[PDB]
Design a protein around this nucleic acid. Structure first.
Ligand SMILES: [Mn+2]
Ligand SMILES: [Mn+2]
Ligand SMILES: [Mn+2]
Ligand code: NA
Length: 348
DNA sequence: CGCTAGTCGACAT
DNA sequence: TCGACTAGCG
């Protein structure tokens, strides 16, 4: 999550409606709808009580898309990424803390604060997502569980031309190189659209509107893969990259103390972290829904050795990747929880 | 002025 | 899954 990215490129956004993509294909970061839908029933998901309201919550959105002739491809998060294991551990810890806090508040009498702790201990399991998948398949809507992060999968779907837009709330999709991103979409169909090509409209970006430089900026600002340097945001990173008259990024990062004229100590492990973060944004494993195989988000360059890309996702057999993609195989238990077969009547 | 980290929100009666 | 708002510090 690139904090303050949306407001930073505000001049490259515009209010639209979904009808602009009428008759076209659009992929969806479904976990946002899952969270917002789970908020309405936080306490019941906290007590372990049976609840399927979030299903209907996502379904009114899906149906709203179907009403305007849109073809939605619901994309779901899959396995945990090693480049995000720290943030995941932290989030898990906070969810646990809030859960225990709320449960303690139930043993007193405070009902509001307990609900406030329960609405911040929301854990979107893969079973709920599977419920949403079943509900979507009952309506004939394509679904796809990403090998890891849904971000990279959406990015691939958008870059491959399989979809023409990405409905999400996360700003990372821009850093992954998505062409068209639809943000802040209500249940009525109104939202903001940020096109990559329009990134040149932002005067405060300068010449930093190319995919590579924009990615470097987003990384230097501070992402989930790598915490930024102390005192470095979007503006200073963009400033460095604008003053960066050098194709090699490493030397620039080593010269960040010069480009900003500040006292910045940069550890080697932070440089390695930047390389790993960049390679995470570039070559994270996604799933080709047509050829049915595990591929990186972008084709490997000649200046990169895929042997040292374990943090960007581990390769598995294409059959397993397909079973996970369909959602038939649970992410954790790695066991078959469903028996859906797309052949026996997205996947051409 | 820009960056940081904490608070607060998304639901919907 | 995330972002929006802001007091407080450089
Ligand atoms: Mn998760
Ligand atoms: Mn994501
Ligand atoms: Mn993300
Ligand atoms: Na930062």
């Amino acid at each position: 999550g690139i904090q303050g990215l949306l407001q930073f490129i505000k001049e490259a956004s515009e209010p639209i409606h979904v009808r602009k993509y009428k008759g076209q294909v659009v992929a969806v970061d479904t976990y946002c709808w899952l969270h917002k839908g789970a908020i309405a029933c936080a306490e019941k998901l906290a007590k372990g009580e049976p609840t399927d309201r979030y299903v209907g919550f996502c379904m009114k959105f899906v149906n709203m898309l179907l009403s305007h002739g849109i073809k939605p491809i619901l994309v779901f998060d899959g396995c945990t990424l090693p480049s995000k294991k720290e943030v995941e551990r932290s989030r898990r810890e906070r969810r646990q803390a809030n859960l225990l806090k709320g449960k303690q508040l139930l043993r007193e009498g405070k009902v509001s604060e307990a609900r406030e702790c329960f609405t911040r201990s929301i854990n979107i399991t893969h079973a709920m997502a599977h419920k949403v998948i079943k509900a979507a398949r009952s309506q004939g809507v394509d679904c796809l569980v990403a090998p890891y992060e849904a971000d990279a999968q959406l990015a691939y779907l958008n870059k491959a031309g399989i979809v023409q837009a990405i409905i999400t709330e996360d700003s990372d999709l821009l850093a992954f190189g998505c062409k068209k991103v639809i943000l802040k979409m209500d249940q009525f169909g109104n939202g903001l659209e940020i096109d990559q090509a329009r990134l040149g409209m932002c005067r405060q970006l300068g010449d930093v509107f190319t995919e590579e430089k924009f990615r470097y900026m987003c990384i230097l600002s501070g992402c989930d893969y790598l915490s930024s340097l102390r005192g470095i945001g979007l503006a200073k990173a963009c400033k460095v990259l604008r003053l960066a008259n050098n194709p090699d990024i490493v030397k620039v990062i080593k010269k960040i103390g010069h480009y900003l004229k500040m006292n910045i100590t940069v550890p080697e492990d932070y440089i390695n972290g930047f390389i790993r973060a960049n390679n995470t944004f570039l070559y994270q494993l996604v799933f080709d829904p047509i050829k049915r195989k595990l591929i990186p988000l972008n084709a490997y360059e000649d200046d990169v050795d895929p042997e040292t890309l374990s943090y960007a996702g581990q390769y598995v057999d294409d059959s397993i990747a397909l079973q996970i993609a369909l959602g038939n195989k649970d992410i954790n238990t790695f066991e078959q929880i469903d028996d859906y077969n797309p052949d026996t009547a997205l996947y051409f």
